[PDB]
Design a protein around this ligand. Structure first.
Ligand code: CLA
Ligand code: CLA
Ligand code: CLA
Ligand code: CLA
Ligand code: CLA
Ligand code: CLA
Ligand code: CLA
Ligand code: CLA
Ligand code: CLA
Ligand SMILES: CC1=C(/C=C/C(C)=C/C=C/C(C)=C/C=C/C=C(C)/C=C/C=C(C)/C=C/C2=C(C)CCCC2(C)C)C(C)(C)CCC1
Ligand code: SF4
Lengths: 220, 408, 145, 143, 31, 160, 90, 57, 74, 80
């Protein structure tokens, strides 16, 4: 199992390095955009011509590499935590036998060790683990929220916003109040950053709550 | 309607989807086949299957309505007054639908977060529940009471009520199992029904906004010239990503998936907790989950714990038995669903630039094909992402449902 | 001119994009109007000083809270049977069961159990009483100033 | 050798029943646009703001909110009905600015007397590196 | 002690309001 | 054929429509008599009326839904919370008035009626008018909250 | 059918007051005089903001500091003996 | 209201992929041609503008 | 122990990403081709394709075989 | 306002001016190509940045380039 997880870690490291190096070396231009250095480090695109140029800047290359770094660190921390939990409980054989297949991971690490976490508050009462369960759900919410910015793009939202201005301007007793800055949807680059921030915050909070609660419920 | 094939297709698809949903709702409460009510797996499978089919057909209706709007609309020779009047006040319709969606989302999902916070803080007496603050569905209970008293008063020719779920009080047991019995309605049903309404309203908003603004808008006056399926109109005007009518269907498929998943989860938990069970010689009913739906479904933590965590032990422990195929499909669908996020979160330029390096080494060894490799288009990438997402999610739910219901 | 002061192009934006982009480009001294190399270096130096001050203030706050609301003195005697205390809790939203459940250790009210390992680190390097932590916090406040 | 035509405020407007896609407070506070054309017969056309309208035979006048809308309408007119058109920009104080075709000759046809703006007498690959213009207010292009 | 009954509301309700009002006035200013 | 919906003021190229909801004589009379549409009256009196009306309203939800709703301190806590909300709203109004209006400038309200008749612009759209409106709103809100509390928990009226 | 005019841009751009009314004041002169007399000090936007901040800060802080445990459960404190943690820890 | 033998039954069109479209039938310069072949397979309205032929298909 | 390990490893990952980000920023903004003619810095931009392709090969090989073995065991 | 530039690799086929959704581009006489024409950008203050001109350039790399720049009420396509 250590062999398999070490090779998975190596795969993650190699893929992240590949993404970052490809982003760094093609920063001054390529065959698709020979004059990329004249447009700066961060810019949305070069239009839909020549087949489409979505995420053509080095900033998007960095933006795509954060997911892989998070995945690799998650694998490393999962391995460390499961191995040390099995060592501390005095049942090291469970990790030796159950770590060679992925269903073993899903059943004997996540499902098994999350019983005390999800019982922080129940229809019968609460105990000191309530805050960790609340943070678990909060992290799930933020991580899911990031998907809205990551999947849906700008043109849908500007059209929706354009109608709300009309609704406000045509409503009695409310058109007496007017804005100073014209509302617009978030820019192309901004939404990627917002989605990435939501993703990372949810990831960190959820794993921290699970790890801390699962260790402290058993070993204090 | 006698010259355009797309409008007829849209109308027929909408009607067929609605009929499929009606059939799915009617089949479970009025079992038409012998020994079908006591076969729980068959009932669950048929319900979920027909609901998914109806949802897909409903989405296709809006898609083809948008196609007709883009292509076959011609006021010069095919003028219609009703269609003209609708297009002249679309802003009010969209704004009102937006307000309704926001209000429903605030006043339906917000009550769940309130219950979670009060439960976490240690104040069970300040929650929206049957014991602290009741939100009773008094209108539906009145309908149940009226239908339970229908025979002999308003239906003299009938001997019994149409369904046993109206609340007659009689229970039918076949082979030691409970076939059907009255279904109570409480505070949780109120919340879940309003959640259903919120999700349906959001999906309708997305699809109708896509259909109505298919030809033009204040942002792109000439949107009809670009066609029904185009990716964008450049980075100008701040950004014009996904302005076509195709992108609105692409976006509404996700919401259809969300709504149908919530509905099927509600059905499964409610039937397992309040209807299905076993009867003994003395006539005491023991349900599958012990009737915990009333007090546990009022919080998100309850849904995560008593439904997702508790009922998934059947599929994760199916290895080494005849049900291991469902256990394999669980992880396979997990992988397929997770694999779709690569196409949805990324763009074409990176993959086109990466291919250039791969082609270079093939040229070095004289293995470069004459059919030049090109990265997928934007529309193709979005379609692949949505297809893999839907397939993974539906396969996961299918495997979980079958593995849970076959064993117990 | 108006906010942002360092960007003429952003200050003339009539939309809400002025605020969002004004926040996100504050520390990119290279793209500011009328910038020179010397001003860039001086700004970097000042920013480094500010970062050091913030770090010292954070450490001083940690020490002060551990001294004021912790259980360091009783943890020293029995390190293996005492749970370290990070700080106290004063939440008006709490219910009575929440007050009962979070009252752990030797505390007289709700508290948080520390998991940063500051207790063992401070005990190893020779700190034994609450008077030492107060002096350390005062010295760190002086360093930040 | 070309004087812009004057705008006639008495030109009638096409037959329209009204919509929610018309002018807003920006027209009151900032500029708006007016497009005029001459039609040989009464016919139905598609409004850029949604719906359908019937244009009158003879002079026609129409107010719009953007230059894109009036240019799209003019392009549709020239492509389908073979109609000549001009449009203007009108400011809140009362000044009218003539915009198109700006010469009496459409942009796609070369006309003597036009000045060249934004011409770089080199290839796109001869732009200098960003390091060579550092700490200055200029860019790699327009240099 | 009684200090948390003062500093917690002072930091969580008063100072955020003052800061938000001042920042809104500053970002809405023009010359 | 008779038609009901008409373009706004006869101009079909303005982004609005005339419907029975907007142009009914009853609705037109009702809206013109609200304190926010009396453009020829002192803004202080309109602000006082608006403050009284809104302050009387806010007591009920706080009183009946608050955490102390099932104790002997329900009314006092609800009234105090309503007063705090009124104070916050007054702060918001003051901030909006400071940020939006500048001293010495004329009013920005329209000076034309629907029938084309010229009229004096509303003075509410100036700094002094908005300040008077905000002060009147604060006074009226506090007075209305006090009146509601007095009626509910000083006089034993048979409510509910 | 002329909707464009250069000498009158108020009607051209639709600068109308739809619901504004020019009717005189309907309130009693005595009541109005009382309200202007007693509500006058709050009409200065410079002083009103500072007064609101100071009053909100002083009133909210005073109530919280002198609160009794019968209202706030956290002011009452724990009322039960503590329970030992895992591995026999306090 | 029927037509006798409108279209001959032959295998000729089987050996020429993309016969329904003029652009696709040119040839696979890049790999986008293969994807475009399948996406426009059943869009009868794009193939021809005759309503009778679309109805017959 | 687990909290300290996870904290430090996540911080190290973020810092490692930032290093490459600022390297790309340097290449875009501060690189001068004339002053760096045919040195070690300039010769890596010459054969970037080989580095990228070899990294792709290594990643594909590792992922293919690791996933294959895991699925076979499952 | 955005910046639009023209380079002397122009062949003067008038494809960019026809695809312009506003009135930004135009053609002027020139010498240096067979068509004896070259494009121009006298009205960049009306530029919105949709980059339709670059979608119509037949030259290997573009003889017309659009650089996004400071945004105004015209370049954002707002009709509020
Ligand atoms: C879990 C993630 C998530 C969440 C929360 C939402 C939420 C929402 N989406 Mg959405 N979406 C998501 C993922 C998500 N989406 C994904 C993955 C996609 C695919 C790309 C979409 C695609 C999508 C479309 C296409 C549309 C939406 C729309 C909406 C909104 C519906 C109207 C509304 O106001 O609802 C009510 C809002 C909520 C329930 C969220 C609030 C949660 C509670 C109430 C928090 C309240 C806190 C309170 C205010 C105090 C805060 C103070 C602070 C100091 C703490 C809502 C905000 C629609 C929209 O714009 O509005 C109509 C719309 O058209 N979404
Ligand atoms: C009676 C039902 C019906 C009918 C007759 C049509 C007919 C049509 N639709 Mg359509 N549609 C329907 C229902 C229907 N639709 C529904 C319910 C939806 C909502 C999901 C849609 C959504 C939709 C969109 C979004 C579009 C159409 C389009 C079209 C037209 C072109 C079809 C085409 O080229 O597809 C070609 C068919 C394929 C490429 C096959 C798709 C393969 C599926 C998705 C994957 C299956 C996965 C499978 C299990 C894995 C096994 C793979 C195997 C190789 C191993 C055609 C007129 C298009 C159109 O009109 O464009 C102008 C278009 O863009 N439809
Ligand atoms: C408004 C609700 C409602 C509905 C849906 C029905 C529906 C029905 N009634 Mg009915 N009924 C109603 C109100 C209603 N009734 C009222 C208010 C009265 C007066 C008390 C009756 C008195 C009545 C009689 C007397 C009979 C029906 C019968 C029927 C059934 C056949 C009717 C038919 O023409 O075929 C049908 C299911 C007939 C029946 O029993 O069919 C089997 C029949 O004989 N109804
Ligand atoms: C016979 C054809 C052929 C040959 C000789 C190569 C050779 C090579 N490829 Mg490759 N490749 C091919 C087809 C081929 N490829 C096809 C069809 C694809 C698309 C799926 C790829 C996708 C691909 C990627 C993504 C990468 C390579 C890479 C490489 C190099 C690393 C060695 C290796 O095993 O990579 C691994 C090779 C594969 C994963 C290819 C999969 C095997 C395919 C499916 C075999 C198909 C053969 C084809 C049907 C021939 C038909 C013959 C028939 C007419 C008689 C090597 C020079 C790597 C490299 O160094 O970058 C330049 C790299 O990263 N290839
Ligand atoms: C960056 C360091 C840091 C951090 C994160 C905190 C964090 C906290 N302090 Mg704090 N504090 C600090 C430095 C810090 N302090 C310093 C240097 C002093 C002066 C010695 C204090 C003096 C202090 C007091 C007197 C109180 C807190 C309290 C609190 C808690 C409630 C927030 C509050 O009322 O703010 C108040 C923060 C300050 C007054 C710091 C100003 C500098 C919160 C956990 C309160 C508490 O325990 O709540 C239960 C409380 O009553 N702090
Ligand atoms: C929409 C969802 C929702 C709803 C309805 C409520 C409702 C409530 N919450 Mg709550 N809460 C929510 C979400 C929600 N919460 C979320 C998401 C959180 C987590 C952030 C919390 C956290 C929370 C806490 C921590 C506490 C509450 C408490 C309360 C109760 C007291 C509220 C109060 O003082 O009055 C607020 C209401 C008003 C001031 C006025 C409302 C008047 C409405 C808007 C009517 C106006 C519309 C009208 C019909 C328009 C007419 C048209 C016109 C022409 C006439 C109340 C029952 C407290 C409690 O003790 O509960 C028992 C409490 O301590 N909540
Ligand atoms: C982080 C800081 C913070 C603090 C200290 C508090 C403190 C409090 N919240 Mg709270 N809250 C916060 C953040 C905070 N909240 C956030 C971020 C949210 C959004 C998620 C909420 C949402 C929330 C709800 C929904 C409710 C509370 C309630 C309460 C009160 C508990 C019940 C009580 O004692 O009734 C006793 C209350 C009184 C006796 C009257 C109110 C207290 C003062 C005297 C009112 C006047 C203060 C001042 C004059 C006006 C503001 C001044 C301005 C400068 C701030 C308590 C004062 C509950 C409550 O009762 O609120 C009224 C309630 O229902 N909060
Ligand atoms: C010693 C640490 C250090 C220092 C001094 C800097 C310094 C800088 N970075 Mg940076 N960076 C770092 C670590 C560091 N970084 C790490 C670890 C990462 C990886 C996560 C990054 C990723 C990164 C990106 C992606 C970018 C910078 C940029 C910049 C420059 C402008 C900063 C700016 O506009 O932010 C202003 C402040 C904010 C935007 C607030 C941050 C909000 C986020 C969501 C967190 C909250 C500035 C020279 C920018 C640059 O050079 O542009 C040309 C840029 O685009 N950095
Ligand atoms: C669980 C989701 C998932 C998966 C499986 C992958 C997998 C992969 N990513 Mg990736 N990625 C993901 C999410 C995912 N990503 C996300 C969320 C992001 C952020 C947007 C990225 C961003 C990203 C970047 C930036 C890059 C990758 C790359 C890669 C590839 C290199 C790794 C490798 O060794 O290939 C292992 C190969 C596999 C796992 C493929 C398995 C092949 C099976 C056998 C297919 C079988 C087909 C079917 C069964 C037969 C026909 C049936 C019919 C129904 C179809 C790999 C295919 C890199 C790449 O493509 O270049 C090398 C790259 O540069 N990814
Ligand atoms: C003695 C000894 C030993 C040794 C070891 C060693 C020797 C190691 C090494 C190690 C190493 C050797 C490492 C390394 C690393 C590296 C890295 C980590 C890198 C990075 C990079 C980067 C980040 C880059 C950046 C950039 C770019 C991209 C561009 C521009 C420029 C720059 C630079 C900025 C052993 C243990 C065996 C045993 C015991 C004893
Ligand atoms: S970017 Fe768009 S608006 Fe600007 S010149 Fe090119 S086509 Fe015209």
């Amino acid at each position: 199992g250590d062999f398999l997880v070490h090779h998975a870690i190596a795969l993650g490291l190699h893929t992240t390095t590949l993404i970052l190096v490809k982003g760094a070396l093609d920063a001054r231009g390529s065959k698709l955009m020979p004059d990329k250095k004249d447009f700066g480090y961060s810019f949305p695109c070069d239009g839909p011509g020549r087949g489409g140029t979505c995420d053509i800047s080095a900033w998007d290359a960095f933006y795509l590499a954060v997911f892989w770094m998070l995945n690799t660190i998650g694998w490393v921390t999962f391995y460390w935590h499961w191995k040390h939990i099995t060592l501390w409980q005095g049942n090291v054989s469970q990790f030796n036998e159950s770590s060679t297949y992925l269903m073993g991971w899903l059943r004997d690490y996540l499902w098994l060790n999350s019983s005390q976490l999800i019982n922080g508050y129940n229809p019968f009462g609460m105990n000191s683990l309530s805050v960790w369960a609340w943070m678990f759900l909060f992290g799930h919410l933020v991580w899911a929220t990031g998907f809205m910015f990551l999947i849906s793009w700008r043109g849908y939202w500007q059209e929706l916003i354009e109608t709300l201005a009309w609704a406000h301007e045509r409503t009695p007793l409310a058109n007496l109040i007017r804005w100073k800055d014209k509302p617009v949807a978030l820019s192309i680059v901004q939404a990627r950053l917002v989605g990435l921030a939501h993703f990372s915050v949810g990831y960190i909070f959820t794993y921290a709550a699970f790890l801390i609660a699962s260790t402290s419920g058993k070993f204090g | 309607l006698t010259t355009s094939w797309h409008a007829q297709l849209s109308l027929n698809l909408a009607m067929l989807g609605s009929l499929t949903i009606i059939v799915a709702h009617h089949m479970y409460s009025m079992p038409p086949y012998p020994y079908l009510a006591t076969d729980y797996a068959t009932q669950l499978s048929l319900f979920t299957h027909h609901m998914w089919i109806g949802g897909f057909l409903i989405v296709g209706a809006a898609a083809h309505a948008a196609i007709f709007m883009v292509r076959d609309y011609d006021p010069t020779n095919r003028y219609n007054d009703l269609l003209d009047r609708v297009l002249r006040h679309r802003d009010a319709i969209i704004s009102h639908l937006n307000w309704v969606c926001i209000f429903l989302g605030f006043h339906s999902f917000g009550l769940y977060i309130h219950n979670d916070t009060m439960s976490a803080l240690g104040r069970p007496q300040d929650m929206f529940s049957d014991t602290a603050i009741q939100l009773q569905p008094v209108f539906a209970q009145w309908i149940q009471n009226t239908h339970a008293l229908a025979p002999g008063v308003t239906a003299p020719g009938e001997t019994a009520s149409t369904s046993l779920t109206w609340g007659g009080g009689e229970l039918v047991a076949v082979g030691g199992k409970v076939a059907l019995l009255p279904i109570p309605l409480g505070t949780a049903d109120f919340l879940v029904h309003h959640i259903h309404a919120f999700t349906i309203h959001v999906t309708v908003l997305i699809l109708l906004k896509g259909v109505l603004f298919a030809r033009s808008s204040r942002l792109i006056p000439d949107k009809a010239n670009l066609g029904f399926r185009f990716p964008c109109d450049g980075p100008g005007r701040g950004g014009t990503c996904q302005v076509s009518a195709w992108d609105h269907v692409f976006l509404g498929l996700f919401w259809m998936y969300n709504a149908i998943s919530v509905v099927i989860f509600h059905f499964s938990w409610k039937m397992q907790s309040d209807v299905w069970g076993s009867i003994s010689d003395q006539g005491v009913v023991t349900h599958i989950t012990g009737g915990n739906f009333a007090q546990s479904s009022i919080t998100i933590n309850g849904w995560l714990r008593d439904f997702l965590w508790a009922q998934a032990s059947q599929v994760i422990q199916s290895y080494g038995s005849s049900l291991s195929a469902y256990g394999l499909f669980f992880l396979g669908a997990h992988f397929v669903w997770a694999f779709s996020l690569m196409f949805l979160f990324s763009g074409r330029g990176y993959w086109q630039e990466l291919i250039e390096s791969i082609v270079w080494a093939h040229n070095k060894l004289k293995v470069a094909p004459a059919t030049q490799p090109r990265a997928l288009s934007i529309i193709q990438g979005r379609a692949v992402g949505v297809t893999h997402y839907l397939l993974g999610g539906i396969a996961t739910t299918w495997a979980f449902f079958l593995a849970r219901i076959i064993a117990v | 001119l108006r906010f942002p002061r360092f960007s003429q192009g952003l200050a003339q934006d009539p939309t809400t994009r002025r605020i969002w982009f004004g926040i996100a480009t504050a520390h990119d001294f290279e793209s500011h109007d009328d910038i020179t190399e010397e001003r860039l270096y001086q700004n970097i130096f000042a920013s480094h000083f500010g970062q050091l001050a913030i770090i010292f203030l954070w450490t001083s706050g940690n020490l002060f809270h551990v001294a004021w609301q912790g259980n360091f003195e009783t943890w020293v005697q029995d390190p293996l049977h005492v749970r370290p205390i990070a700080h106290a809790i004063w939440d008006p939203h709490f219910g009575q069961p929440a007050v009962e459940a979070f009252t752990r250790g030797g505390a007289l009210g709700p508290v948080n159990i520390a998991y940063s390992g500051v207790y063992q680190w401070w005990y190893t390097i020779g700190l034994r009483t609450n008077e030492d932590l107060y002096t350390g916090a005062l010295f760190l406040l002086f360093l930040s100033a | 050798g070309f004087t812009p035509p004057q705008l006639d405020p008495n030109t009638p407007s096409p037959i329209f029943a009204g919509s929610t896609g018309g002018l807003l407070r920006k027209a009151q506070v900032e500029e708006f646009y007016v497009i005029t054309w001459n039609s040989p017969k009464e016919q139905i056309f598609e409004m850029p703001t949604g719906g359908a309208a019937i244009m009158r035979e003879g002079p026609n006048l129409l107010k719009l909110a953007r230059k894109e809308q009036c240019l799209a309408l003019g392009t549709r007119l020239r492509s389908k009905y073979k109609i000549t058109y001009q449009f203007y920009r009108v400011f809140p104080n009362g000044e009218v600015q003539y915009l198109h075709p700006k010469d009496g000759v459409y942009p796609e046809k070369a006309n003597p007397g036009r000045e060249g703006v934004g011409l770089n007498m080199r290839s796109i690959g001869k732009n200098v590196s960003p390091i060579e213009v550092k700490f200055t207010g200029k860019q790699s292009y327009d240099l | 002690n009684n200090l948390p009954s003062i500093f917690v509301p002072l930091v969580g309700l008063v100072f955020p309001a003052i800061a938000m009002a001042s920042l809104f006035l500053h970002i809405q200013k023009n010359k | 054929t008779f038609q009901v919906v008409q373009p706004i003021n006869g101009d079909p190229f303005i982004g609005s429509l005339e419907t029975p909801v907007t142009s009914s004589p009853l609705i037109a009379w009702y809206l013109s008599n609200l304190p926010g549409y009396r453009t020829a009256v002192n803004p202080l009196l309109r602000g006082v009326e608006v403050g009284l009306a809104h302050g009387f309203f806010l007591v009920g939800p706080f009183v009946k839904a608050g955490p102390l709703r099932n104790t002997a301190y329900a009314g006092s806590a609800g009234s105090l919370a309503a007063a705090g909300l009124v104070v916050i709203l007054s702060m918001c109004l003051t901030i909006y008035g400071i940020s939006s209006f500048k001293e010495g400038e004329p009013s920005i309200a329209p000076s034309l009626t629907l029938t084309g008749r010229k009229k004096q612009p509303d003075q509410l759209q100036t700094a002094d008018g908005w300040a008077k409106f905000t002060g009147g709103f604060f006074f009226g809100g506090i007075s209305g909250v006090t009146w509601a509390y007095f009626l509910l928990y000083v006089l034993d009226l048979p409510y509910f | 059918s002329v909707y464009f005019d250069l000498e009158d841009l108020g009607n051209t751009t639709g600068q109308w007051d739809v619901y504004g009314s020019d009717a005189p004041s309907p309130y009693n002169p005595l009541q109005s005089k009382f309200f202007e007399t007693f509500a006058a000090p709050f009409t200065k936007r410079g002083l009103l903001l500072k007064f609101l901040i100071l009053g909100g800060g002083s009133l909210l802080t005073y109530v919280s500091a002198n609160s009794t445990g019968d209202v706030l459960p956290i002011k009452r404190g724990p009322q039960e003996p503590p329970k030992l943690g895992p591995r026999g820890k306090l | 209201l029927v037509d006798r033998d409108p279209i001959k039954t032959s295998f000729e069109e089987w050996a020429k992929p993309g016969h329904f479209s003029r652009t696709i039938a040119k040839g696979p310069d890049t790999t986008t041609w293969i994807w475009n072949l399948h996406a426009d397979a059943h869009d009868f309205d794009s193939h021809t503008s005759d309503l009778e032929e679309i109805s017959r298909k | 122990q687990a909290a300290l390990y996870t904290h430090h490893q996540y911080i190290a990952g973020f810092i490692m990403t930032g290093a490459f980000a600022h390297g790309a920023i340097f290449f875009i903004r501060d690189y001068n081709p004339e002053q760096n003619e045919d040195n070690v810095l300039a010769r890596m931009l010459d054969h970037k394709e080989a580095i990228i392709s070899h990294l792709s090969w290594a990643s594909l090989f590792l992922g293919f075989h690791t996933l294959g073995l895991y699925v076979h065991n499952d | 306002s955005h910046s639009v530039k023209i380079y002397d690799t122009c062949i003067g086929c008038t494809q960019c001016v026809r695809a312009c959704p506003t009135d930004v581009l135009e053609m002027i006489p020139w010498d240096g190509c067979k068509a004896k024409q070259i494009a121009s950008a006298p009205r960049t203050e009306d530029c919105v940045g949709c980059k339709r001109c670059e979608s119509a350039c037949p030259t290997d790399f573009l003889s017309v380039r659009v650089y996004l720049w400071h945004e105004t009420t015209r370049s954002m396509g707002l009709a509020y």
